[PDB]
Design a binder for this molecule. Sequence first.
Ligand SMILES: Cc1cc2nc3c(=O)[nH]c(=O)nc-3n(C[C@H](O)[C@H](O)[C@H](O)COP(=O)(O)OP(=O)(O)OC[C@H]3O[C@@H](n4cnc5c(N)ncnc54)[C@H](O)[C@@H]3O)c2cc1C
Ligand SMILES: Cc1cc2nc3c(=O)[nH]c(=O)nc-3n(C[C@H](O)[C@H](O)[C@H](O)COP(=O)(O)OP(=O)(O)OC[C@H]3O[C@@H](n4cnc5c(N)ncnc54)[C@H](O)[C@@H]3O)c2cc1C
Ligand code: SF4
Ligand code: SF4
Lengths: 340, 340
Amino acid sequence: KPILVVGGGPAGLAATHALANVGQPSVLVEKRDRLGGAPIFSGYAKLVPSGRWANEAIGGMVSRIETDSLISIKTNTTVVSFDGDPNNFTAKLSDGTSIDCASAILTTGFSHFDSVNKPEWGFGMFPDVVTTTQVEQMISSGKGVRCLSDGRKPKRVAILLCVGSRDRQIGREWCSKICCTVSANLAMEIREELPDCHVYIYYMDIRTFGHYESDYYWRSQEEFKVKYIKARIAEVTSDGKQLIVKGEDTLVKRPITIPFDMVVHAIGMDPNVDNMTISAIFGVELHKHGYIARKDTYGLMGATSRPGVFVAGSAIGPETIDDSIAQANAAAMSALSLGR
Amino acid sequence: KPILVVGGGPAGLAATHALANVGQPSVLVEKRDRLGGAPIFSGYAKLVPSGRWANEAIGGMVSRIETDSLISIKTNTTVVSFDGDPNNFTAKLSDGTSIDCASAILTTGFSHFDSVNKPEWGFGMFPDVVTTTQVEQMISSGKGVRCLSDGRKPKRVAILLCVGSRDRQIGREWCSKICCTVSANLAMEIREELPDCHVYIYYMDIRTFGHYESDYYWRSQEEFKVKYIKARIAEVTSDGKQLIVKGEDTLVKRPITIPFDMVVHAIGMDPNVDNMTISAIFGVELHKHGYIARKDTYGLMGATSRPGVFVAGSAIGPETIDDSIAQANAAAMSALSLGR
Ligand SMILES: Cc1cc2nc3c(=O)[nH]c(=O)nc-3n(C[C@H](O)[C@H](O)[C@H](O)COP(=O)(O)OP(=O)(O)OC[C@H]3O[C@@H](n4cnc5c(N)ncnc54)[C@H](O)[C@@H]3O)c2cc1C
Ligand SMILES: Cc1cc2nc3c(=O)[nH]c(=O)nc-3n(C[C@H](O)[C@H](O)[C@H](O)COP(=O)(O)OP(=O)(O)OC[C@H]3O[C@@H](n4cnc5c(N)ncnc54)[C@H](O)[C@@H]3O)c2cc1C
Ligand code: SF4
Ligand code: SF4
């Protein structure tokens, strides 16, 4: 009897591999054409905290399951119906396949915030307003960091933190957790490629928690001369030659009008746009902010509101790769407990 | 053979229970007289993010293993020698017992920072300078938040963040990760008990990441009127009857001299004082800052530098309870893979 794992990103790749390593078969259902989740589909460059290229690090997590006979992979597929009870579930797939499964682990991840939803910060208005995902792709493709307007190397880059996060006005109250460290990492990578480029990070708080404090926040300043300015950004405009970052220096109303060649948005981790459908299909409760709800960890690790259905990773909220992998292995550990 | 789990806090309690739930026996070695780790021996009150009392939440994690015949608990015991290879280890315990084990999981945790090590901030000088652990104990005992000097209810409380963290001068470069949220939680608990008490939190950054942003940072301000001031604290002194917090108000570079009844230190999570001994005994590498090193998560989740030895939780660095529990379940999952 296999365990159904839904979503083939870092979390689903970790859960299926962990189960295969104890001789438990699984079926991995992935909606996209390829596995790897956001780090692969979105072309991430070097990951935090390892410094390894996502194509290699997550690519290896994909490779090792693609030829493991205990894992049946279904790409370009979704679960259209799910019924039954623990050790007696039936999952029907979009291609007509029916799977008799013991349990299900939801590793369906998140959705990148679309910066068109924060219009005052200029995304979609000006080509040189880019997301962190675009910068990751410029680096990971080896093309390099360049302005989209004319292909030039930027001499001044601003990174705006909290784009689509910590923003009650657009219904996104959460902190997306990893964007501070990702921005510090990207700022160092920009500086390594472009030694004449000045990088400024405009923030509300810097949240390089744990080991990220010295490895990313300190290092970005001392080795790479990245500048950090506490400011509430009002808008991004254009004077026809440069982009202009307008805001209030500190937490008060001290006006700032600073010119830049490129403005990067540290976009947040929205709940997966498919969560209302996943909730209806699997019969699992959602968190008040739209993520898939998880019970407290002291009881059954990774449990959803439904017996026999588990959840791990960014499906539950903004989350890092290391934590998503730990959660996925733990949810696999909980699903195995149903066999007694 | 059984799996050896060292340290009976949240992580060790989670690993042993998860193994027993799949029929794998374990031996839990705990140096102290009781299980529960820091939340129990340090008398934590309500936990984040659950809001449940640690005595109930972690107490249940202890209870459920104390009568599970698949788990052999050895309190007041340490591992004095460890030798062998995966599926062929021998652990010798301080009580003379010898354990033939398949693998070992290190869940040996951390050590609370002692603020006698930041003397300019008044700990040990004045009875009303307390740690967050002391405030947790005032609440969890049901005695309530009271000044040690005369037993009065404080009317003004200051919480100083980053005590023993983010401080290169004392060799503690890391961010201790959970103290921002713990302080916001404690500030709300103080306000709930003492409606006439004003609580001020002095910070460098507020790091209520993920779901903690709206549940703790925003709620502490909007529902509980907790005040947050960005400031670098130079010293804590006394005028004879009250404490004086002296610093520099970051936002508008101007000095501050503010009176308080109680000053709380948000103490950091140092590496376990036993880590050099554990490293020597188990033959595992340490992180540059003294924690137990963990390999990257993309390979084998929870692996140390030594084959067959795993690590989870605050042993690796400052860590939350939910993350420590997930990591412990994941390390149990990796230890099970050694059976092939
Ligand atoms: C710019 C940027 C850089 C980042 N870099 C880092 C970094 O360096 N380090 C770090 O720790 N974190 C990083 N993160 C965070 C990282 O993206 C997440 O931790 C990680 O992708 C979460 O993995 P996951 O498996 O939970 O979800 P995802 O990566 O979102 O994978 C979910 C998978 O499920 C699939 N899926 C979705 N819906 C369905 C459905 N209905 N049916 C079936 N399949 C479905 C998706 O197609 C996808 O393949 C970064 C984030 C951003 C925005
Ligand atoms: C004031 C305060 C409040 C906190 N509140 C929260 C909260 O609300 N929510 C949250 O998520 N986090 C909280 N934390 C963090 C929390 O304490 C940790 O996440 C948690 O204790 C880590 O669990 P652990 O099992 O890794 O380690 P520990 O709790 O440190 O347990 C380690 C165990 O191993 C034992 N041990 C140590 N050395 C040896 C050895 N040589 N041999 C054998 N046994 C050994 C110890 O005696 C102990 O029982 C708080 C921290 C502080 C300082
Ligand atoms: S991690 Fe940093 S950039 Fe991301 S939402 Fe939180 S405070 Fe903003
Ligand atoms: S979590 Fe907050 S209080 Fe703790 S070290 Fe980090 S910034 Fe300081």
